[PDB]
Design a protein around this nucleic acid. Structure first.
Lengths: 159, 49, 245, 88
DNA sequence: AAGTCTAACCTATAGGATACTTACAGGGACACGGCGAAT
């Protein structure tokens, strides 16, 4: 699944690091829990290797995904009605899904609508959080000075 | 069980005769009715309570 | 033991008790009533709208209208009564749900039963503006209206010092942000953090905090406070008027 | 004291009512008395209160979200159902 | 300086639609109610 020190994408948390796979003989079987660490508060997760793919253990997308999401965020004309509830729930679901393209589409939409008027309080926090995770995975895929990563993200997003 | 565990104490055999109640289910019914006025008694609820 | 009879006679005798707890009492007032079926609720709403149209048609034709037939009049009056009883039954079915969602704002501000009744009013407004043309669950639409009503009433009746609804909104917003900021950082957030968070000058947070303050009952103990709460000038004013004399 | 008089009204339940003012003022058309509801003069003026239409009513709520034809259809359906119930 | 004349701000009302159905001492005294003989 992964060796020691690999980089892993575990949504909705995003980037994480694996250190080992301790096989906890609990339940009479050595549960190959891949010990994993995150960056938010150094939380530790023990994911069974038997169902690692089920819980969402995966890798950062290659540059093909990067160019695909570049095209996705370049695309205008994403419409929306007057209300707020529809987009709020939609972006909640698509951010909880641990996807790269849809998070980019929703963050682009929210960026442009904020730049137009300025919406609310908590949606600014969600915009920030989405931008942070996108920058983190971009730096992870490119290893490109995450401050530089967010600067270039802003540059391409502004277009 | 109560009688055999205690074959000597007059007070408790007197209580057994004068308890005027028969059945563990009936005892639970009485206990539930007393401790839960207004509640429709039922045996599983009585034992769990 | 179901039809054990005795076992149900005990239940009936227990149903006829004094009982003084009002929250328990209302728990049993809706106790007698049951739940509802979605499609049954659709038909209920249909009957409600039909009876409503009937009564308004009566009111419109009441002036310079027509001498309606006895059978027609009887049937339309019956439809109107059926609609009223239908909405009563619908509300009776929904009392359980509104109670179940009103139990989540207890322990604060006002009485739980008070929350219940304000939620009941919100429920009446929800049925007042319920649309079943798409045919979705009534409860999901309702929750928004009941929560709206109870939040309104909480805001209007929270404190002895009346504050506008906008201020209730900014205050509970301030409290929520304060709580989560403590949860993340663990250090007391400075007022300037809130000032920049909401994009305001360094005064709004102070005023909002001062409004948020709860009055302290003069009744207290340690002896109540009211006892310990606070002739030169009066004598002087009389003397000065005389001095002018 | 200042030249002062008393303005005259009457509340709806008969009781003739009265509240003081100064002579130099407008004796208003309307006043909320001590009993607790609005009243007006028995003197003239008669400012024609002209009450506003009610905030809201269940009918107009159904109006902005429904029309006449489908409600007529529901009314007819109920009518024929009840007619079958009574006489068949 | 109140009397206008001008230009904001603030708030009671209202409105949005997955789903969710039963909370959380002690003492004296009197009045409301067990146990027994009589008709």
């Amino acid at each position: 699944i992964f060796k020691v020190g690999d980089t892993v994408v575990y949504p909705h948390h995003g980037a994480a690091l694996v250190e080992a796979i301790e096989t906890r003989t609990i339940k009479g079987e050595q549960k190959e829990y891949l010990v994993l660490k995150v960056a938010q508060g150094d939380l530790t997760v023990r994911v069974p290797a038997e169902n690692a793919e089920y819980v969402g253990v995966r890798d950062v997308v290659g540059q093909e995904g990067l160019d695909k999401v570049f095209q996705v965020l370049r695309a205008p004309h994403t419409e929306e009605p007057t209300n707020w509830s529809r987009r709020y729930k939609a972006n909640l679901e698509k951010l909880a899904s641990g996807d790269v393209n849809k998070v980019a589409e929703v963050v682009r939409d929210l960026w442009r609508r904020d730049q137009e008027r300025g919406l609310s309080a908590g949606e600014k926090r969600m915009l920030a959080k989405a931008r942070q995770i996108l920058v983190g995975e971009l730096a992870l895929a490119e290893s490109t000075d995450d401050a530089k990563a967010e600067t270039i993200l802003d540059e391409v997003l502004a277009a | 069980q109560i009688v055999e565990r205690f074959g000597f104490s007059e007070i408790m055999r007197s209580t057994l005769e004068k308890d005027n109640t028969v059945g563990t289910d009936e005892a639970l019914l009485d206990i539930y009715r007393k401790l839960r006025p207004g509640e429709p008694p039922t045996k599983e609820s009585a034992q769990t309570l | 033991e179901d039809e054990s009879e005795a076992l149900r006679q005990a239940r009936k005798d227990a149903e006829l008790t004094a009982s003084a707890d009002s929250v328990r009492a209302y728990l049993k007032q809706i106790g007698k009533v049951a739940l509802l079926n979605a499609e049954e609720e659709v038909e209920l709403a249909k009957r409600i709208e039909a009876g409503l149209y009937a009564t308004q048609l009566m009111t419109e034709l009441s002036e310079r209208g027509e001498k309606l037939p006895a059978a027609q009049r009887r049937d339309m009056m019956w439809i109107c009564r059926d609609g009223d009883r239908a909405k009563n039954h619908l509300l009776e079915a929904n009392l359980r749900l509104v109670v179940s969602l009103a139990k989540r704002y207890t322990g604060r501000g006002m009485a739980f039963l008070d929350l219940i009744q304000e939620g009941n009013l919100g429920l009446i407004r929800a049925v007042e503006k319920f649309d079943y043309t798409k045919g979705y669950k009534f409860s999901t639409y309702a929750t928004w209206w009941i929560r709206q009503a109870i939040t309104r009433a909480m805001a209007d009746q929270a404190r002895t010092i009346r504050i506008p609804v906008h201020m209730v909104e900014v205050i509970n917003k301030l409290g929520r942000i304060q709580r989560e900021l403590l949860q993340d950082l663990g250090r007391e957030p400075t007022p300037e953090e809130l000032a920049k968070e909401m994009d305001i000058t360094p005064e709004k947070v102070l005023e909002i905090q001062q409004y948020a303050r709860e009055p302290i009952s003069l009744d207290q103990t340690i002896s109540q406070l009211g006892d310990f709460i606070e002739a030169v000038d009066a004598v002087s004013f009389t003397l000065l008027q005389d001095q002018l004399q | 004291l200042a030249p002062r008089q008393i303005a005259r009204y009457r509340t709806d339940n008969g009781e003739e009512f009265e509240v003081p003012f100064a002579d130099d003022a407008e004796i208003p058309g309307t006043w909320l008395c001590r009993n607790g509801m609005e009243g007006t003069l028995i003197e003239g003026d008669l400012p024609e209160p002209k009450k506003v239409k009610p905030p809201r009513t269940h009918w107009d709520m159904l109006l902005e979200r429904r029309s006449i034809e489908e409600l007529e259809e529901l009314l007819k359906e109920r009518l024929e159902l009840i007619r079958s119930r009574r006489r068949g």
